[PDB]
Each structure stands twice: as structure tokens, then as C-alpha cells.
Amino acid sequence: STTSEQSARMTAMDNASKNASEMIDKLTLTFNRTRQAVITKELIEIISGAAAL
Amino acid sequence: TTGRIVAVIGAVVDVQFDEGLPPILNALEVQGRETRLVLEVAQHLGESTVRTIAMDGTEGLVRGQKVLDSGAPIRIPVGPETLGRIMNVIGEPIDERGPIKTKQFAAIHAEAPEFVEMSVEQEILVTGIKVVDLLAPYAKGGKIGLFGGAGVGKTVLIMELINNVAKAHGGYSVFAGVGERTREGNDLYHEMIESGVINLKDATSKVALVYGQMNEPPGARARVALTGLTVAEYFRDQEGQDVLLFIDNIFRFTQAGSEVSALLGRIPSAVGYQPTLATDMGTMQERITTTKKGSITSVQAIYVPADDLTDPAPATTFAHLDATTVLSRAIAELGIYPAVDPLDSTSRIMDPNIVGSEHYDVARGVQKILQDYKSLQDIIAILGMDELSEEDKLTVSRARKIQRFLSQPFQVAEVFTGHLGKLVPLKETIKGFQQILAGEYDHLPEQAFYMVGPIEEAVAKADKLAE
Amino acid sequence: VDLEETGRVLSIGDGIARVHGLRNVQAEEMVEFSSGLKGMSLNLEPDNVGVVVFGNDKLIKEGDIVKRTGAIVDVPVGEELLGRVVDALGNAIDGKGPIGSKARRRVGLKAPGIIPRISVREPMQTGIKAVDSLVPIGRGQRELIIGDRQTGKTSIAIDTIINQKRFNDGTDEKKKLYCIYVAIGQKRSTVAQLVKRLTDADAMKYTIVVSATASDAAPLQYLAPYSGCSMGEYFRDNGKHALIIYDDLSKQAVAYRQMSLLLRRPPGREAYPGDVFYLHSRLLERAAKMNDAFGGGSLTALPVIETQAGDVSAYIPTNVISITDGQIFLETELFYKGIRPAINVGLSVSRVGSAAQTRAMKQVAGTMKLELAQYREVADAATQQLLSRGVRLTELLKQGQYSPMAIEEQVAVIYAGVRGYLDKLEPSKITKFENAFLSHVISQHQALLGKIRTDGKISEESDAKLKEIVTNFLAGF
Amino acid sequence: KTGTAEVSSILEERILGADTSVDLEETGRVLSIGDGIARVHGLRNVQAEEMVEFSSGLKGMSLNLEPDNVGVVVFGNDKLIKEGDIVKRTGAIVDVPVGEELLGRVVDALGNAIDGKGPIGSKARRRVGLKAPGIIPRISVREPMQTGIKAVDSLVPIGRGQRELIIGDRQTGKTSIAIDTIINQKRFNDGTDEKKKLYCIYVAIGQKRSTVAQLVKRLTDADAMKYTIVVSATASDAAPLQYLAPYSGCSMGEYFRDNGKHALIIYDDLSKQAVAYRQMSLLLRRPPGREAYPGDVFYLHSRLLERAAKMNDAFGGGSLTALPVIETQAGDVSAYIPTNVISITDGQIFLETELFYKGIRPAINVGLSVSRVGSAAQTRAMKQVAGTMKLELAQYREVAAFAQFGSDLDAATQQLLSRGVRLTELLKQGQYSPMAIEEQVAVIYAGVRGYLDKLEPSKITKFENAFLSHVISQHQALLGKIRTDGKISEESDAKLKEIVTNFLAGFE
């Protein structure tokens, strides 16, 4: 039982790390999109304020 | 023609020409200047006024100074006498070795070759480097992106490419350093002098350097890539040969363009880049092609902001790249050189229709075996080396031999490796990797493949170290 | 100086000249500058005229003389353009002589209304098994090709163009398709190589190529799609069939964003103006399918979009997905893995072309689609069977490059695959079987394929003979 | 359209021919004044960045020369300036005094003493806007700039003529790195070796006056003012003074560089010079860019930092190291100014708060820190020990995740964890207690040869202490040999082995 339990824990941790890696990839893509969008939004606000004087 | 400076806002100078206006992109020289100041026109505001971006510091200018219209855009000295000479964007030498004497001058604002001055067939540029020529061949007249850029061998690789291209095909080379640190610029000058690609004595140089410094105004760092392109276009057209053009860095090219666009008073676009980003990049990258006379193969060092591959700068440059090289810190640790990541490197012409079926199959087999070894390394780290089959230990051995054989000794690094540089032709590389994959050399030791030229050198090394 | 039919450039810079004069210039009219360029008069203002220059602003100077041509922006159209490359204004750039065309069409002409059109009833054959069986494209449809950097979209377009030769070499005037390839913001090297590839496949004699490469000013890239669409509308309205391929429609969006920002317009989401949706719908609403009271012609459209890191819910991809009649999602993961064309049949749909698909292909591809759908949901007994069959089909739909297939060969191959004849063949050898099998049927048994093509269905006798052929061949492989 | 000089007063003057009695060449009349920006009419013969002087005794820098008017930025409160005032040319671009007469003096951005110790000597003047050297005067960085900090000197070496960058968050130790670097140079300045003396300049942009006063007290306590200049541009100073102070410091250091000596300038903090320039540019109605910063802000920092050079012997051989300090926010080194200055400089000392509170003060985060000069800026002995230390630390950083587990892992990772923990406890340092290079090399040599693999980590910080005193008292000949010689000779290696074993053989 202990042999099989340790093997199963190794397999489960491998799968959990793989799933966390996929989720990290997706969230990194989302974070890059959001960061660029925030930069553009703030810059457009500044531009509109400057041109609206 | 003579005009007057009417305004001076930062690096932007508004001039007024009572007689006749100079067309856009011309260069105007400010008269009454201790050091040559050149202003590039960029707008026609009306009322005979033009707005110009300055190529040098505008401090000390007075509303009214006379400005002389040259009549043509920035014209630089191009020829065989620029080889081994540093010169800034406006063509003035900055290495203090006297004037660049030439009988030719070229305007830096030219147009891409027309649709009929274009080679219709792809080609391959043989650089004499195993990894580059096998897993990521460099298309002739195609842009190559180069990643890494930190103590991994970028400069030694650049110098080796220069030497091989000037030794194999005999073409020269240009090194346009956009936004170049002066410390690293001087270091590079001296590394070239030591390795031999520049010769201050006998005039047998192989590189023309063009430095747009990092403390020049934004209007100068944005145009040095064009000065380098002009110096290379001379060799392409007039000399009718294949040239190399190293642009380091290209992100700095886009960034300087962005700064100029902001200074002129233009609304930024996506991530605060110039609204003309795509065209500003295209007008340059479209002059690096394979005309019917010669060709220019460019090598852009590339920096990815925030490690974001979708940032407008690399998202726009990657549209132009025709290949890719990825120097990796993780491979210089292993003592493999050049530290080119065999798997992350990419090429567009790695296609059986272009590079040939045998080359394509050898490259695909090498990539597959390297991926297999990469996968097996996890098993080795966890379950231990014993767990392998016998049709997997064999693949591990073959992949280690292939990794060793992909390393090479450079002619410009004989003071780092103690060996003698090798310029491996293409057929030699393909045959060597075909033989290693077939298993013809499974009886040799792995270290017999480390840092050797063709495969026969591996055989000789095995004999010399075993006997 | 005639200040009615002529004006003087008040201020050049940004690619938007301000002219003073031209008091009788119509909105959206084309004017000609002294140097040689041409422009379009956007903003008719009280005191000046904002002319967007179709070229490089370097050539224009303050003081130059602008002369109105007298006609709205239009391009030369006709049969005379087939086999020629042309810039965005219809001026040849392949150096084979003057274009010489008799008819000129407006690039801003409006799309046909609701009554001229009619449902899509004819198939547009692409010779790509994955596209032809799973996401069929009819004639008059607008089927977006959306993908990433290097995933094989221009390959889909060029395989379609090269495949149309079976029909453009025959005599049936009702099947001939005239192709148009609009290249926007794209390396000129690529355009030249593509034109050579077409000339080598004898596919230029019925193909127009409109170029607006990356070295061409923004207005030319913004105007190339409309020039191409007018060149195609000529055939559509003259009772013939055309197929226009805009490539890409995201480079046009970037060019239009540059044009708008340089005009100081309010940037929106991702700095794109508010007109981008209008910019693209105005263009893709012209790919209609006229009814027989208007000629019966058609104009298919295959816009190409390059997502960024696989983001399909971006702004421009979503606009063009809200404009078009389907999708062909090319997945980069599949492409790098080894599947090519890397079509992600899960997310790729064709709303309209499903009813235009050919009966012979219809019946076989129906069961192919069901089998692939079942396989998609399980990736013991039935599970193992589904995995095996799905892998067989997936390896069956892999295809070479620049080697399109006639519909009959696709029918034969997919029939062999879906009826379980390869259920014992090892999954790797399927391609080796496929490329071999075709040769057999492409040599000895031309009568069967010809009968299938003519009858337009897999009749029971055709079914039996095809069964015999496939089983006998599989016996000796 | 409209102009700012079309006000009815100017037109009134010009209509009735009253514009000929006014000298609109060397004098001007203020059209507008607000938020520290004056718009002046006249001054037709005024140069860009020239200094004008208002009637009320104030100064200003004329930045925006437009067709109608001149945009002057005032060097002080615009309380005293009123519309209609009279502004006179000074004739000369802004310059500052330079020389050894400034050492030990606190000055403001314009070279005026503010410590009340009397006038400033000042024999020579120098323009703050002078082009840096070129490709040719320089030569490769070779000499080391002894920071006196074990981490910085071992794993992030700083040469002379190099532009490092102390980038970090708020309250992590950046000013402490700078002050320890300044204080460690006393052992060289006191001595007689004339090519090791380093003169220090501390530019304090945007800090409150109490902070600078405490800092000056700290330097005086350590007797490290007699070779230090401090250039204060505190928060109450007008934006132009905060903008200029880095350039005044850089010119006061360029003097030493040109005259064969060696200088170290610590632009602390550059992210506040960027803010001051941003304010000036926005109030001059210049087109903003990302984050509202003007377009030419990369230019602003590059033309400043590219004056840190290592001149060659044909020019004097002097040098000017730069240690710009930038305060990142959360941890965003991808922001605008952090990005610019990371792309301008030659390295970066990257500080953390996680490390600061985990007990690893100074919080230098190795792995993210880098020095593109590297071993070229190290002594032979420091090279010898630091190569192994860096290799071992790199091995330790990729298995540090297991630290909590540790046990139930192979012996190799056990050894890696143990050695890494000992080495990190070695790199810990006090505050304002720099170390000579011989002391650092002795300590790291003891650490990286396994002679601490028996001591418990909690005791290492004590060992390091006591051991050091031992060698600093009993064994001065060996330390002097290592110092002057510069390397560890085989005899010296044996002596270090014996010393470390003898001291460790009885510690407890």
C-alpha cells in the first residue's frame, strides 16, 4: 500500500503541476492583454485631456 | 536656399524659407554652429514654414539663425573605403582616423526595389555553422531575428558570421548599431580589431560600422538603421554581391521612431507607439531583399518588452523575420558553442521544397531525437537512469552525441578554445548528422564529437584520444 | 490660376495634404498632384480640402498644384487584368505593359440590397480535404480564415486558387471561377514568390493580384481591398463567378488606424477608430450571390485575419467574425505538432456552405463529421474503437502543399477512411496508403471517378464498385 | 487659430508706434506667469536653454522658443513674478562651479552653498550640458570600484567608468548601498596610493531636507565628507532645480574625470528627476507620451548617464562611475522610466523586501542582479573565490524550493541546500560597516571551501564576525600580502587554510 500510495502521489503531483502550467500560460496571455489595454486606456485619457483644453 | 530658425521646442526646430521650400526628408545645415548640426524636414506647416527633427543637440540655437538647404536628403559616403570605419548617422567619421575618402555619396532615404527587381526563387545562405545551417538555415536576403543578448555569445557569433560570410562568399558586412551604448560600442570596436574583421593597417577590413549613439536625440537613433542600409545597398547594387547587415538593436529602432513621432505631436496608437509603426518598420525592412544584382541578409538583435511576444514592437517585427536564432544561457553552461538553442531556433525555409528533401529529413530527425532526449531527461531525473529501455538508452546516447556535434570552434575565438576555427560546408554538416542518426558512430565516445569541424574530425579525435 | 478646378497644397505632412482651392471638387473625388501622385478628397472644409495622398508624401510640397480629375475614386476593371499584377490604383507593377482596360468602377460603390441576392447554392471547391468535407464553402459565401503567424493561411488561399484550374480549363462557363488575391501590408518578396508559384501552376491566366505591400503608404493599404472588390464585382455583375482573397484584413485595419490617428480622430479600443467595423463590413457586404434576374453571378470572399497569440476574442477578429458567414480556425498547436492544414475542426464552422456541399461528398462527410465529433469527446471497447477511427481520420485529413485534390479523389479517400477499411492499418501508414491509393484510382479506374463526378452522387453501383476497389487494393498493400 | 502674443496690449503698443522704444532683443516683458512657467514677449536674441533673469531677482531657463514668445521655467516660486515684468538675458547657458573647493560642502543644484559654512571657493566653471566623450577616448573597464559590500563586490562587481543601477522598491536599502559605497572609500583616500582614491558626489533629488541633513551627519560621523560633495534639490525646490541637479553633479564629476582623478556620482533618485521634467514639459504644453512623460525622456536620462566614462591614458585615465537609483513600484521593472534606465545602464543591483524581511539585509537579489562588465571589474583573489561562490549560489537557487522539504531528498541536494544556506548567511552584512577586499575574500574563502559545513547556520553570522576580528588582529601580514599583491599565492592559500582550520578547530 505504501509503495502504491507514493507512486500515486507522484503521478497526481505531476498532473497537478501540468494543469497549473497550462493555467499559468492562459493567465499570462490574459495579463499581457490587460497590461497593454491599461497602458492604451491611460494614454488615451491623457491625450483627450490634452486636446480638450 | 537659406531660411531662418523661427522656433525651437526641444529637439524640434521650425524653420522659415522665404524663397523656396525644401521637400520633406531633406537635410538642412544650421550655419553658425561649432559642430555640424543637421535638421531633417518632416512637415510643411504652411506660410513657408517647415518643421524639422534635429539630429544633434539644439541647445544654443537662436530664433533667426540661418539654415542652409542642402537640396538632397542626408547623403553619406558609401564605398569600399567605409569598411573598418565607424561613422555616425550623418556620415561623419567618429573613430578619429581622418575623413572617409570616397568618390560616391548615397542618400539614406531610398525606396525598396520595385516588384520586378525581385528574386522570385528562395535561396539558402551557408554561414559555415552547423546548428544555423541545419536547424535554422538563413535565407539569402531575408531577415533573421537573434534572441538572448547577454553574455551568451552574441558578439562572438556576430563576428564569426562576418568572417565566414566574408571568407566563403566574399561579401562584406555592415554593423548598424541603433541606440548603442558608447562603452559597448568601444568594446565591440576593439573586439573586432582583435579578432581581425577590422584592420587599421593594411585596409583589408570586412565590416563597416555605423553607430547611432544612445545619447543622440531621438531623431538620430531613428535613422542610423537607414545609414547602415545605404552602406549595404551600395555593396548590393554597385558591387553586386551578398551583404550582411547586423542591426543591434531593432527594438531601439522602433523606440526611437516612437519618440520622434511623439515629439512631432502625433497621437500614439496601441501601447503608446507611433501611429506609423507598421510603415516605419516596413519602409526599412523592405530594402533588405534579394534584388537581381545582389542581396542583403539582415540580422536584427531583438528585445521583447515585458517578455511579451504580442507587444506591438515584436508583434510587428516578427511579421518580417524569415528565420530565428535563440542563444540560450542554459547551453553556454554546458560548454557548447555557439550556444544556439537547437529546438527554439526556427526558419521559414526549413521546407522540403526549398532546402531539399534530404536536408529537411535530416533536420527533422535531429529535432525529433533532441525532443526525445529532452523528454527522457525528466525520466532520468526522477526514476533514475536504470528505468530506460534499450531503445531509449540508445537514443539518449545518440542525442548526446548530436548535441556535442552541433557545437563548433570559431575562427574568431581561437583565444577562448585553444582549437583552430572550422568553417564547415553544408554537405559536410548534412552527411555528419545523417551518419550520426543512422547509428554509424555508436561505438565512439561522446567527447569525441565535442568542438570539432566535420565528422572526419570527430573520427580523428576518437582515434587520438583512445590511442 | 483657376481656383475652381485647381488648387495649391497649403500644407503637406502626415500623408494628409491640405489644399486651397478646388472649389468645385466633389467629396471622395480623386485629384492629381503635379508631381505625379494621386489623392482622394476626404474633408471638404469651408476654407481648404483635406486630400489623402495615395503614395509617399515626400514627393508633395507646399505650393504644388492639385488638379481635380473629375471622377470619384475608381479603378480599371475587366478581363484585361487577368494574369496581371497591379498596385492599389490599378496601375500595373509587373512591367508587362499598360493595363489597357475599357471599364472603370468606383471603389466606394454600394453593396447589393436584399432582393438581388439569393441563397448560396453552388460549391466553391478548394481541393483541401479538411475544408471541403468538414467546413464547405459555397459560392457567394464569406468564409473568414483566421489564424496566427505562420500557420498556413496563405497556403489555403493559394491551394484554392490553384485548384480552380480544373474548371477554368474546361468549357462549362458556369463553373469557371476567376480568382483575385489582394496582398496588404505584406512583404513584397512574398508577393513575388507567390506570383511565381501561380505562374508555375498555370494559375495566373485567370488570377489578378493587387499589391499594397509593407513599403506602400497607408492609404494604399487601406484602398487595396476596395480596388480588389471592384475588380471582382465586375465579374459578379457580369454573370461570372469571382473569388477575392483579402490577405490580411488586419493589416488594412492597422493602416486605417494610422490614417485616422494622423487625422486626430478619437481613438477607441486598442486605439482603433470607431469606423473599423464599418470599414470591414462596407467591404465584405459586397461578396454576394446575385439571383438570375441580375445575372446569376457571384463573388466569394476569403478574408484572412492574423490573431495574436491565438486570441480569437480580440476586437478586429470579433468584428470580422460578426461580418462573415463562417470561420476556418487554424490552430498553431496543431500546425507545429504536425497536422497540416492545422484546421481546428472543433471551432471552425461554415453556416452557409453546408447546403452547397456536393451530394457525393455530402453523404461521406456527414459520417466523417459524426465520427470526428465523437472522437473529440473522448480525448475499453467502444472508446478504443472511437480513438482508433478518429486517429485514422485525423491522419487522413493531413495534406501536402500546392497539391489540391478533385472532389472525386476526396470522396474516394474519405470513403475508404470512414467505412473502416483502414481500421486495421497502423495509424502511421495511413498517409503512405493515401498517397498510394489515389495513384491507383487516378490511373486504372478513371471511369468510376468520372461517373461519380458527372452523376454528382455515390450511387449504389458506384458504391459497390468503390467498395471493391478499396478492399482489393487494401488486400495488396 | 491664435497666438499668445496677440493680446491687445502688444497690438496696442505696435499700432501707435510704441514698439521702437523697447529693446526686444535682450529684454522681454512677461506675458503670462503660472505654475512656475512664464511666457515672455521679446528676448529675440535668446538661445535655447539660456538663463534669463527676471526683474525681481529670480532666474529662469528659457526652454521653449516659439515664434511669438519664449517659455521660461522659473527657478523658484512664481509669487514674485507678475505679468508685465522685465526679463533680461544673462547671455550664457547655465553652468556650475567645479573644483576641489566643493569637497565636503553641501550645495544646491546651481552650486550655491546651503550649509552656511561660507562662500564656495570655485576657481573654474563648467557647463552642465556638455556632450559626453566618444567611442575613442574611453577604454574598457578594468579597475574595481570597491563597494565594501560582500554581495555587490562578490556577485555584482562594479568597475570604474561603469553605470550600475540600484533598482528596488521603497525602503529596501538603496540609499544604504550608496552610503556604504561612499564610506568605504576612506581606506583609499586616507592612504597615499593616488590611483585608488575615489571622490564621491551624492545628488539628492526630491528628498526632504531632514533626510539630507541626517545623511550629511552620517557621512560626517564616518569622516567621509572631506572627499564628498552633496548636491541637494529637495522637494521644496522648483521643478527646474530638481531637473538640473543631476547635471550639476555630473559636471562636478566630469571635472574630476577630465583632470585624471576618479569620481563616483550617485544620482539618487532619478525617478524624481523624471517627474520634475514631466511637470515642466506638461506645463509647457509639450505633447505627452506614455504615462504622460514627454517623448524625450529617454534622451534626458541617456545624455546624463553616458557621461560616466573611463578615459584612456592619452586623456588622463580618470573616470566617473555612476550609480543611479530608481525606485520601482510594486516590482514593475517594465514600467517606463525603469525600462529606459535599465536599457541605458550596464547592470543592476536589484533589491527586495521579501529578502529584506527574511533577514537577508542587504536585500540584494542575486539572479536578477547582473553586471555586464563582470569579472573584468574584480581583483584576482576576488575572482578566484567569487567564481566558486557564484556557481554554488546558482546551483542553490534552482533547488531552493525544496528547502522546506529538504530531507527525504538525495544527498546531492542536501549538500546544495546546506552550502547555499551557509553562503547566504555569509553574504549578510551589517549597516555602515563596509569591508576591505582582503576581509571579504578571507570570509568568502572560508565559506566556499566547506569550512562552515559543520557550523549551524544561526552561528555563521557570529563566526564571520569573530573570525574576521581574529585575522584583522593576529594575521596582518597575510592580509597585507593579499591586498598589495592582489591575488592569493599558493603560500597565501596555505596560510588561509591553516588560519581557517585553526580558528574553526576551536570555536563553540
Ligand SMILES: Nc1ncnc2c1ncn2[C@@H]1O[C@H](COP(=O)(O)OP(=O)(O)OP(=O)(O)O)[C@@H](O)[C@H]1O
Ligand atoms: N499543408 C501544408 N503542409 C506542409 N507544410 C505547410 C502546409 N501549409 C503550410 N505549410 C508550411 O507553413 C509555412 C508558412 O505557410 P503560410 O505562408 O501559408 O502561413 P501564413 O500564415 O501565410 O504565414 P504568414 O502569416 O507569415 O504570412 C510554409 O513555409 C510551409 O512550409
Ligand SMILES: Nc1ncnc2c1ncn2[C@@H]1O[C@H](COP(=O)(O)OP(=O)(O)OP(=O)(O)O)[C@@H](O)[C@H]1O
Ligand atoms: N544591510 C542592512 N542591515 C540592517 N539594516 C538595513 C540594511 N540596509 C538597510 N537597512 C535599514 O533599512 C531602512 C531603509 O533603508 P534605506 O532608507 O537605505 O532604503 P531606501 O530604499 O533608500 O529607502 P527610501 O528609498 O524610501 O529612501 C533603513 O532604516 C536602514 O537602516
Ligand SMILES: Nc1ncnc2c1ncn2[C@@H]1O[C@H](COP(=O)(O)OP(=O)(O)O)[C@@H](O)[C@H]1O
Ligand atoms: N565559440 C566560443 N568559444 C569560447 N567561448 C565563447 C564562444 N562563444 C562565446 N563564448 C564566451 O561567451 C562570452 C560572452 O561573449 P560575447 O558574446 O562577446 O559577449 P556578449 O554576450 O556580452 O556580447 C565570452 O566570455 C566567451 O568566452
Ligand SMILES: [Mg+2]
Ligand atoms: Mg501569408
Ligand SMILES: [Mg+2]
Ligand atoms: Mg533612500
